[PDB]
Ligand binder design. Sequence first.
Ligand SMILES: *[C@@H]1O[C@H](CO)[C@@H](O[C@@H]2O[C@H](CO)[C@@H](O[C@@H]3O[C@H](CO)[C@@H](O)[C@H](O)[C@@H]3O)[C@H](O)[C@H]2NC(C)=O)[C@H](O)[C@H]1NC(C)=O
Ligand SMILES: *[C@@H]1O[C@H](CO)[C@@H](O[C@@H]2O[C@H](CO)[C@@H](O[C@@H]3O[C@H](CO)[C@@H](O)[C@H](O)[C@@H]3O)[C@H](O)[C@H]2NC(C)=O)[C@H](O)[C@H]1NC(C)=O
Ligand SMILES: *[C@@H]1O[C@H](CO)[C@@H](O[C@@H]2O[C@H](CO)[C@@H](O[C@@H]3O[C@H](CO)[C@@H](O)[C@H](O)[C@@H]3O)[C@H](O)[C@H]2NC(C)=O)[C@H](O)[C@H]1NC(C)=O
Ligand SMILES: *[C@@H]1O[C@H](CO)[C@@H](O[C@@H]2O[C@H](CO)[C@@H](O[C@@H]3O[C@H](CO)[C@@H](O)[C@H](O)[C@@H]3O)[C@H](O)[C@H]2NC(C)=O)[C@H](O)[C@H]1NC(C)=O
Ligand SMILES: *[C@@H]1O[C@H](CO)[C@@H](O)[C@H](O)[C@H]1NC(C)=O
Ligand SMILES: *[C@@H]1O[C@H](CO)[C@@H](O)[C@H](O)[C@H]1NC(C)=O
Lengths: 93, 93, 104, 104, 79, 79
Amino acid sequence: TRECIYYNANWELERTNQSGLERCEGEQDKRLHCYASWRNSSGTIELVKKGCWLDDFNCYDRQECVATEENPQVYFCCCEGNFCNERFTHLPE
Amino acid sequence: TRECIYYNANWELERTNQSGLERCEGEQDKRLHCYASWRNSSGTIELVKKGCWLDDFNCYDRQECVATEENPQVYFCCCEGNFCNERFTHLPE
Amino acid sequence: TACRKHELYVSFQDLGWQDWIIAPKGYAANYCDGECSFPLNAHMNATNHAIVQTLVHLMNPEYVPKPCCAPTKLNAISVLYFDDNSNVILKKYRNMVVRACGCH
Amino acid sequence: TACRKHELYVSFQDLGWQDWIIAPKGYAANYCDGECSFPLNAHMNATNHAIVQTLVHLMNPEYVPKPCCAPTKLNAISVLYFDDNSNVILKKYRNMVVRACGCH
Amino acid sequence: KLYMCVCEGLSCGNEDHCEGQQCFSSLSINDGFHVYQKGCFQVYEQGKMTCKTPPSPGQAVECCQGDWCNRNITAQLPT
Amino acid sequence: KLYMCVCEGLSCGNEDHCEGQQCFSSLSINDGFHVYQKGCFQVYEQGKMTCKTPPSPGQAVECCQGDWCNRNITAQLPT
Ligand SMILES: *[C@@H]1O[C@H](CO)[C@@H](O[C@@H]2O[C@H](CO)[C@@H](O[C@@H]3O[C@H](CO)[C@@H](O)[C@H](O)[C@@H]3O)[C@H](O)[C@H]2NC(C)=O)[C@H](O)[C@H]1NC(C)=O
Ligand SMILES: *[C@@H]1O[C@H](CO)[C@@H](O[C@@H]2O[C@H](CO)[C@@H](O[C@@H]3O[C@H](CO)[C@@H](O)[C@H](O)[C@@H]3O)[C@H](O)[C@H]2NC(C)=O)[C@H](O)[C@H]1NC(C)=O
Ligand SMILES: *[C@@H]1O[C@H](CO)[C@@H](O[C@@H]2O[C@H](CO)[C@@H](O[C@@H]3O[C@H](CO)[C@@H](O)[C@H](O)[C@@H]3O)[C@H](O)[C@H]2NC(C)=O)[C@H](O)[C@H]1NC(C)=O
Ligand SMILES: *[C@@H]1O[C@H](CO)[C@@H](O[C@@H]2O[C@H](CO)[C@@H](O[C@@H]3O[C@H](CO)[C@@H](O)[C@H](O)[C@@H]3O)[C@H](O)[C@H]2NC(C)=O)[C@H](O)[C@H]1NC(C)=O
Ligand SMILES: *[C@@H]1O[C@H](CO)[C@@H](O)[C@H](O)[C@H]1NC(C)=O
Ligand SMILES: *[C@@H]1O[C@H](CO)[C@@H](O)[C@H](O)[C@H]1NC(C)=O
């Protein structure tokens, strides 16, 4: 089992939870991960979506959460670990 | 819903019911029928298997139970009706 | 040239199951045939993977073959057959007939 | 010439889903290919209808085509995509990857 | 919701009336021909993914959301 | 029960060991060749139906119930 911090920016319109930590779910023999997605905004960091992510090949054994994509409209980093979506950096690959 | 008389000749070995009337079961939009199978034995009629039968094209609108097969090792007649497996005749087609 | 449910009647006299099956002498299998091309309408009951596959086939024809027209909804039929000990047994064989063919 | 699970990596840059999908940039579809011939071993996960069909094909080749190598076990993948109102939404698309291919 | 649109094309169950969440019109280049298709999508996930692809050579999936929205929105290939 | 038999042939998961309810050996005429197959059946209904067919031109499904019963029971076509 695993668990990631679930913050959703659209809490109002979808009448969903804004803050909290949510347990992850998945099928047998299926790794679960944490995902974070935010907007840098030339320094003014604005968190967008954070939560659980299903099995992904490119998101494997990521003890930290690093957004390797260079100059993206929405930065996105996937990590494998318990509550690994609380720290994130943009390190271009 | 439908119901047919269930008599099974193998009641001993399979530890199943010998006599009785059993409700039929089937899926939605699936006709159910009654089936009887016996051995004539040159006059000494011996009932074998009687019970519920699933959807069958050749067993359609058979208000009676007639075994049309000529000279079979085991006579078999399928009927469509409530408790239609209590009377059976061997009328060759 | 479209995923359809072609109807046919298969007889057990032709398959050689003649001296160990008492009834039915034959039933209707209703095989499936056709081809699946991008995009697929709601009539062709297809999965998301089928759609991704037909799209990657449209982008590159030799990369991936088209999806396959496969049965999706099946029913069961009762078979009264002889065993190896001259006894007769009734069994509900599952997934014997086809009632819907999609691009599975 | 056998129902197998060929592995491949499909990228969303090639399918044109580049400016409305944030992650993943690509995944593994693992398409299925091969042929099914009578009889079928337990490895080829096949239904009873598939067996009846391959048998009626062996008896007569032009009557019925061979069964189709189709996926049987599928999983789901999470997609974080833009909608039509510049918002971003996470959705679990079901039946996107293949983990077993049988003669369905 | 549900929307009734025409279902002309090589593949349909002999009913032009097609009730779907997203109707569309497509024009491909499959098997070197100009096959035309018009239909409906009763699956939101599939309708979206197939209506968000960018028109290009080989595909022309122009969709529509309204009532009988498919009749006069014939697809056309790009440049 | 379960019985371990060889799984030689064009289709197997790279494991000769095949645990099944009914092992067999087949020799067909598919695509005009003499392809040989040897395997196991972990499905009683399918094993029975495929082992009750009468050997003829095109098929030679000789089955077996015992331990390693498949090794030396090679199939042979009829007259
Ligand atoms: C949001 O974007 C800003 C601007 O691109 C990011 O700041 C940048 O962080 C990188 C980290 O590698 C800095 O590069 C390094 O900086 C110093 C010298 O300035 C030195 O350690 C290295 O030689 C290397 O060049 C980069 O300078 C810096 N840019 C600016 C304008 O400050 C920031 O990390 C992004 N934050 C998030 C949360 O995405
Ligand atoms: C078990 O088998 C016996 C013997 O085959 C069946 O009796 C046969 O019943 C048929 C019914 O059509 C009789 O044919 C008719 O008989 C009389 C003249 O005998 C007349 O009505 C018709 O002209 C016609 O020929 C047939 O004669 C009779 N055979 C004998 C030897 O009596 C019997 O019906 C079978 N019973 C079951 C339950 O399967
Ligand atoms: C995709 O799956 C759907 C749903 O199972 C299939 O729709 C089904 O199509 C059949 C054949 O047209 C319909 O049967 C027909 O229904 C009426 C009423 O009896 C009549 O026209 C015919 O006598 C026949 O029985 C069936 O009702 C219909 N099911 C539903 C729920 O709409 C569809 O065929 C599948 N796609 C393909 C390509 O096979
Ligand atoms: C018919 O269905 C069965 C059951 O789903 C499939 O068997 C599965 O085959 C795959 C591929 O060989 C196996 O995965 C492999 O397992 C081991 C352990 O990790 C290793 O050799 C490989 O790393 C790979 O992951 C899988 O375990 C196996 N499942 C079971 C339950 O035995 C079979 O492939 C299907 N038939 C066809 C023709 O695809
Ligand atoms: C979601 O909100 C409900 C209702 O207030 C609350 O009971 C629950 O603990 C919340 N969950 C998380 C993960 O924050
Ligand atoms: C089957 O036998 C059980 C146990 O005696 C009995 O309760 C039940 O009514 C029987 N059913 C029929 C159809 O005879």
